[PDB]
């Protein structure tokens, strides 16, 4: 009684190329869902993951090892225009953490909250081809982490 779309992409980074690996590929992936409710404009979910580490190197095989992921969760409603094409709209806020010290203590700690925000853009080239284009932007005054989603969907 409604249909349903799901649409899976990986997060992608910029990065320099110059004709060797000298940075290495960053990892990280998305999933988006889109649910349909009787309304004028529907909803949708999205999940991001991805790693944040120094994956360049400053002359060759030489970086420095750390390593921190960042968790976001976002969601929006998804404008559609007139059967053309579909705008989403990325709303929600990140949090990531790869401290460890001890599960049981008294310790005074702190907490920052990311605020994650983003758009997307959705193209119907094909009935069975759907092209899911977005951006999120993390933004943390300690880090400010730029991230671009590319994917597709499949709907129907």
């Known amino acids: 009684e409604g249909e ?5 992409g990986y997060a992608q980074s910029r990065v320099k190329e110059d004709g060797y690996k000298l940075d290495k590929n960053p990892r990280g992936f998305n999933l988006k869902y889109r649910y349909e409710f009787n309304n004028d404009w529907g909803v949708i979910g999205s999940f991001a993951q991805t790693r944040r580490g ?4 400053v002359d060759g095989f030489k970086l420095i090892d750390g390593d921190f992921k960042y968790y976001s969760v976002t969601a929006g ?3 559609r225009i007139n059967e ?16 460890f010290s001890s599960i049981f203590g008294q310790s005074e700690s702190r907490s920052k909250t990311s605020l994650a925000y983003g758009a ?3 193209f119907n ?3 069975n081809f759907v092209i899911d284009a ?10 400010k982490v730029g991230t671009w989603m590319l ?4 709907r129907f």
């Open 77 to 79: 409603p998804v404008f």
């Open 84 to 99: 053309y094409v579909s705008l989403y709209g990325l709303l929600g806020a990140g949090h990531g953490k790869a401290k």
């Open 151 to 154: 994917g597709a969907g499949y």
């Open 54 to 57: 120094f994956e360049e190197s």
């Open 4 to 8: 349903s779309s799901i649409s899976i």
């Open 134 to 143: 977005s951006y999120e932007y993390s933004k943390l005054d300690d880090v």
């Open 125 to 127: 080239p094909h009935p």
């Open 120 to 122: 997307g853009l959705q």
